[PDB]
Amino acid sequence: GSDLGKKLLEAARAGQDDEVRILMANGADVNATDNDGYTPLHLAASNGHLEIVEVLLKNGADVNASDLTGITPLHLAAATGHLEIVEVLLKHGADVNAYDNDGHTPLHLAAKYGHLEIVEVLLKHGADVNAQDKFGKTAFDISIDNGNEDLAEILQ
């Protein structure tokens, strides 16, 4: 890293709020990246650690960092169903229409895992309802293909 870089990735992933605060105060690189291209923000967002996601943003974390597969923190929070985190990312500049390597946007991932509120929030924040992935699928297609018809109804 960082030495501290690496430690901050681990703390953010683990959700150790005090550890994250102490590591940052001692100079830890808020945008440290591991071998998957994850940043502390990716890990904290994926694992549902809200307070960490917040303090990382307030201290310079790149809200749109892309990992090796083209996935951003917003993609992870939408896929894993962390609604409040999705809202915080969006409030801090997250690109609502980020495209990963497979051409999946946050809307596509939320649709795939049946996270209805997230889909609504993303659409309220400018998600392209007609976006298609590398398979020609829209969020709507994905919602019915995965048995999520209640989501299909709002994408429709």
Cα–chain-centroid distance for residue 12? 14
Residue 73's domain comprises 1-156
Determination method here?
A: X-ray
How far apart CA 5 and CA 64 sit, in angstroms, is: 18
Q: What is the CATH number of the domain that holds 109?
A: 1.25.40.20
How many domains are there within the chain? 1
Q: Write the DSSP assignment of 27-52 as a string of letters.
A: T--TT---TT---HHHHHHHTT-HHH
How far apart CA 18 and CA 115 sit, in angstroms, is: 30
Resolution in A: 2.0
